[PDB]
């Protein structure tokens, strides 16, 4: 009897697509409404696009990092719980039941 796993990984199942689509929409807006007449505008839009690309890349990578760390901690916690139960099995007498 437990809730659905979808709500546990809320930082990867929900909050990543939000920001990814937001950033892509901003990039499309910039590219579409860039007007070719002004050299300063074009030069600015260049680095805007490049920056948004770098941002979305790093935003993707950070989640991989966090997820690897979480998996490691999970397996360690499983080992610890098993050892703790095995240990506490022997001290059944002290606990008054």
């Amino acid at each position: 009897s437990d809730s659905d796993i979808r709500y546990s990984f809320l930082s990867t199942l929900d909050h990543l697509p939000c920001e990814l689509i937001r950033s892509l929409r901003l990039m499309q807006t910039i590219d579409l409404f860039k007007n070719e007449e002004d050299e300063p505008g074009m030069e600015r839009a260049c680095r805007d696009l490049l920056l948004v690309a770098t941002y979305i890349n790093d935003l993707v990578d950070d989640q991989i990092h966090f997820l690897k760390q979480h998996k490691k901690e999970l397996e360690i916690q499983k080992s610890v719980t098993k050892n703790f139960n095995s240990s506490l099995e022997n001290i059944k007498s002290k606990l008054t039941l």
């Binding site: 979808r6 990867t12 990814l20 892509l24 590219d31 579409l32």
Partner: protein, 93 residues
Amino acid sequence: LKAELKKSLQDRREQEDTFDNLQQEIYDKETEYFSHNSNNNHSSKSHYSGNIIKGFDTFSKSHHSHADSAFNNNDRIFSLSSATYVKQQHGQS
């Protein structure tokens, strides 16, 4: 200088070739990425079938169906993000 002119034109042609190749590769890769769904549900037995972007609670065993191979063209959220792509889309349709 016509020499500088042709020196610019050659690199221009190479650059537009690379750009078109990148566009096509992104297109096909995203098609495969959105279509890969059915293989895991049809063949451990990780019944979780469904992507992360378009995926919803079908990315959980609460649902069971085999129509997961349905996807339209308004979901190419990685190729839509360019101006040339949407202009060509609206031109051809």
